[PDB]
Structures are given as C-alpha cells and as structure tokens.
Amino acid sequence: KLLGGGDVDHTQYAFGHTKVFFKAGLLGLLEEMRDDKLAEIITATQARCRGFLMRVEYRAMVERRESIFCIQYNVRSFMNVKHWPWMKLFFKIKPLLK
Amino acid sequence: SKAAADDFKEAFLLFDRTGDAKITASQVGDIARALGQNPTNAEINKILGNPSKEEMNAAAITFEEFLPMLQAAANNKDQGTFEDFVEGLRVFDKEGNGTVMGAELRHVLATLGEKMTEEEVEELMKGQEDSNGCINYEAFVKHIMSV
Amino acid sequence: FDETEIEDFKEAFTVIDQNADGIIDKDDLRETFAAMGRLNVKNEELDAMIKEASGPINFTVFLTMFGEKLKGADPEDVIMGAFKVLDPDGKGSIKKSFLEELLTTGGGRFTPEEIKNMWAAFPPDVAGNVDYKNICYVITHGEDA
Amino acid sequence: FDETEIEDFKEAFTVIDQNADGIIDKDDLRETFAAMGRLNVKNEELDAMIKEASGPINFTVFLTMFGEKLKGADPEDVIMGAFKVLDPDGKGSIKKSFLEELLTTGGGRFTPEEIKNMWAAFPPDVAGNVDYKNICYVITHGEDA
C-alpha cells in the first residue's frame, strides 16, 4: 500500500512473501528518470487538484455569506435587548400566551 | 489582450480586503485559480522565487504585476487534459468500473505530492461518494471539471 | 418580522395595556409590573421606557421601537438551521475552538473579545460550541431558563 | 377538483376579498398582505398578480387561474395512496435509489436532473425516498412546515 505514493519507478521493485526487491544501479537509474516524470505528470496533476480544491471553498464561503450575517446581527440584538425592561417583561409574560 | 477582459480587474477588487487595489502575494495562487487558471503550487512558488520575490515577508501588490503573472500562467493551461486524469484513477483501482474506495482517494489527496488538507478533501468528495464507500470517478472528475 | 412574531408582540402589548384603549401609558407599565410582583417599581424606570419613544406607545410605535432594537433578531428555527449547517452530520454539539476560529476568520462580528463575551453568560457548552440549542432559546427569549 | 378543495379556495377568496363584493381588486391584495405583516408590499407585485388574469378576480376567475397552474395538483390522501403502493408492506419509508430508478425507468417525468431538484428542497429523507408523508404535506401546502 505504501508504495502507492511517490513520483517513483513502480518497476524497479518487486514484492514477495517476505520482502520487497529493489534495484539500485540501472534499474535504479530508470526509476529516477521515472521519478522526474511524475513530478511532471504529478506536479501538474497536483495543481489542478489544489486549484480545484480551493475552487470549492469559494462556493462554500459564498453560500455561507448570509447565514453568518443572520447569525451575526441576530446575536447582537439579544445582547442589547436582554437588559431592556420591556423585553424582560415580554419574557416573563411570553409564556402565559397561547 | 482585452480581448481585453476587464473583469479580471473587477475580481481583484473582490479579493482585496483593504480596498487599496493591491493583492498580497499569498493570494495570487488562489486568484489565478479563480480567474480560470490551474498552476500547480510549486509552479506558483518557483515563478515567485525565480523573480527574487519572497512570499515569506510582507507583500503587496499592484495590478501591474498581477496581470502579467496571470498571462504567464495562462500558457500552461494546455497541461489540463482530462484523458490523463481519468486514466490516472483508472489505474488506481482494479476491475472494469470507475470506483475508488473512499479512504484511498482521501489519503492520497492529502499526503501525496502537494498536500491538500483533509477539510478540502472532504469538501471535494461530499456528494459524489455515497455510503457504499465507492467513489465513481467518471462522474467525480466530470464534476471537478465543471468548476 | 414573521407574522406570528408580530402576533406575539400584539399579545404582549395587550397584557401591558390593561386599559385596553390601544396606548400604553405609564400607569399601564406600573400596573403590569405590580401584577408581576414589582411593588417597588420606580417612576424613573417608567419614564425611561417612555423616553425611548417620540410619541405615545400604540401598537405601531411599539413595533417600530422593537424593530429598531432587534435589527438582527433571529427566530429559533433559523438559528438551528445555521447550527445544523455547522454540524452537518447531525446530533453533535460543535467544538469550542471551531466556533471561535470560524467566527473570527470569516467575519469581523466573530472577532475574539466578543467571543469571550459569548462564553461569558452563554455558558461553557454554549460558549465552547459543543451544546447547541440552549443558545437559540436564550437569543429568542433572554435570561437563564 | 374535489368539493372541499373548492370550498378551501372559496374561504381563501373571502379572506383576500375584504370588501366582500365578490371581486378581489388590488386594494384587497394589499390589505390582505398588510394584515399578514407585509408593510412593504410593492404595487408591482399586485399588478403582476392581476396581470395573470384577463378580467377582474371573481370566484370563477380565481378558480380557473388556479386550475391552469395546478393541472397536476394531488391531494395528500392520493399521494399517500401511491406511496403505500410503493411501500406495500406498510410503515417503512422507501429507499432513495429505488425511487430514483423507478421514476426514471417508468416515465420521462421521473428523468434524473429532475430527481436532483426533488432532493434539493425536499430534503434527504424525502429526496432519498425513505420518509414519506412530509412530501405529501408540502405538495398540498408548500414551504417548510
């Protein structure tokens, strides 16, 4: 599973019942070239992702836009009100209602 | 070129939080992506340093530097081929059907190469992966290229 | 202002206006406070309530005074709507540090000092952002329940 | 149109026609909205409601306008009839994927895109096809209950 990642030559090695087999120094050379080739392949595939990743963040940030405000202002009210005679009154009284 | 797209300047006024018409160098990566460009973060990093520009110290910007950096990144959009994106994930899971097991794509997107946070990984899988734990990447890469 | 909230303010206006003529005077304020147990309600408290209006307290003057003090008042179902979007998996009360970071980093209304005042009477759970729901109760109806 | 549904539209016609002469004019629309809490109801909204009719809004013009917009309106008992045939063992809300497959594969009205719009305000359970009954409520009387 580990070797899943890395911009490494997935050739140069080989697994078996008790251990992995690995090249150096040719196969070692191969891989290296390979390694660079994924940064390319990879580096480029990373980017879009990265890009894209934040692109979804904006869609969320934006949605959120108002729900906050609502929350924002809404609290403030209370902080002001909760100390107001009339509002306490309404409060004790709010229950007797139907 | 103008085609002079003056909406890039109007989007710079939506990303500058101070209203002085400057955008810090740390925002330039994400704003190139929001203008329709996907440069990798190492590429955005290199170019910066390449020009003896340090993203480690305070930065400001001017529109006169951000415009040519977006035009230097715009040539690299020929690297965005969807054949290689779907074939990458088709080599990532066995059998003839496009499904990644949930945690395979989440751990690979967070730890392999350019680190994506697990918060962003969950926001990119939310809706395309159901409770079977299998992400269909035919529709997943389609929706990722819809934005 | 939803219409049931305006009907709640009409019922509170009728319970404070014990002369039933449509205008709450200072005698109505004092006799509503005396019927709630306030035998020592000073005349200066009644004069400070009347000093918040430019005219007599009829139903539309009471609604405009409450509108101008409650310009960010949110009903309990919309506060629980926003808290269900903050906890989108349901049931769990959200973490203390997650609400402090998301209040600050999104908006200026979520700045810290204000977050210390949020924790300060909205107790721990509420303050912390773990429980949920008791804060929606006390934002629509104040004081400890 | 069943007769109790026509009597419900006759009662709604009498509550919007506050002059009780049998024709809802623009003043009746504005005074019914002001009695529900709409103090800012614009005249252009009242003109757009009157622009949906070719004549004055009497009881038969209001019934024909609602008939032509509700050409697939179904009462709650017939929607629960069809959902009891989809869940013929009773009690259980039916699966999300079963309603998506059976809407598409039977009819063109059950095509997917429309199924994403069904899940989109008809929430999860409703959308999914698991609960049942809340969707019959909101199809006969809109908005969140």
**Tokens representing residue C93 in the block:** 């009360």
Helix boundaries (H) for chain C: 3-16, 26-36, 43-50, 59-69, 76-86, 96-104, 112-119, 124-128, 134-140
| Residues 6+ away with beta carbon under 8 Å from B112 | A4, A5, A6, A42
Residue C72 Cα, gap to closest chain A Cα (Å): 4
Nearest CA of chain C to the CA of A91: how many Å?
6
- Mutation target among C85, C139, C140, C144 for the A interface, most CBs of A within 10 A: C139
Amino acid found at C136: C
**Crossing angle of the two packed helices B102-111 and B118-125, in degrees rounded to 10:** 140
Q: Are B108 and A4 a contacting pair at CB < 8 A? A: yes
Q: Residues of B with CB below 8 A from A10's CB?
A: none
| Chain A residues closer than 8 Å to C32 by CB | 89
Distances (CA, A) of A35 to A40, C120, C140: 9, 56, 61
Which positions in chain C touch D36 (Cβ < 8 Å)?
Answer: 3
Is the sign of the CA dihedral A65, A69, A70, A72 positive or negative? positive
Query: B73 and A41 in contact (C-beta within 8 Å)?
Result: no
| Residue B129, beta-bridge partner list | B126, B135
Residue of C nearest to A97 (CA): C11
Q: Supply D138's token pair.
A: 């909101």
Within 8 A of A7 by CB-CB distance, chain B residues are: 113
What subunits touch chain D, counting only 3 or more CB pairs under 8 A?
C
Q: Kind and range of the H or E element at D77?
A: helix D76-86
Is the Cβ of B114 closer than 8 Å to some Cβ of chain A?
yes
Q: Which residue shows structure tokens 């405000």?
A: A69
Q: Fill in the amino acid letter for C39.
A: L
Gap from B66 CA to chain A (nearest CA, Å): 17
Experimental approach taken = cryo-EM
d(Cα D106, Cα D101) in Å, to the nearest integer? 8
Distance separating alpha carbons of residues D105 and D113, to the nearest angstrom: 14
Name the residue among B81, B80, B83 with its Cα closest to residue B37: B80
Pairing of strands B99-101, A19-22: unpaired
H/E run at residue C120: none
